[PDB]
Amino acid sequence: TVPPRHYCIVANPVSRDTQSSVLFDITGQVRLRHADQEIRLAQDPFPLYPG
Amino acid sequence: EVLEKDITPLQVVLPNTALHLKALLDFEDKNGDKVMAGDEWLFEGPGTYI
Structure with a gap:
């Protein structure tokens, strides 16, 4: 049961971090998803994950 | 549409x-060149301006 949730980093200010959830990977970087912990900026308005 | 009000361009x-x-949160947004x-x-x- 989840009513309100988001994936917004209000400009560069007030930004957020996370427990990593790396599902898609480019030809440059393939990363550990539930072993590492991550940091986030505005340049990432991609949606949410489970873990 | 979010984060908005009425600014009188002083x-x-x-x-x-x-x-x-x-x-x-800005680096370079204006005319001549690019702020550091x-x-x-x-x-x-x-x-005035933006």
Whole structure:
């Protein structure tokens, strides 16, 4: 049961971090998803994950 | 549409007053070239801006 949730980093200010959830990977970087912990900026308005 | 209000585009020119701008999340947004960081500018003369 989840009513309100988001994936917004209000400009560069007030930004957020996370427990990593790396599902898609480019030809440059393939990363550990539930072993590492991550940091986030505005340049990432991609949606949410489970873990 | 989010994070909005009604700003009256304030103006000033010469000895009159001055504008102590900074860059909250900005690096290079204005005409001549490209600012280095979240640093600060002065504003003296005729018209205002964004």
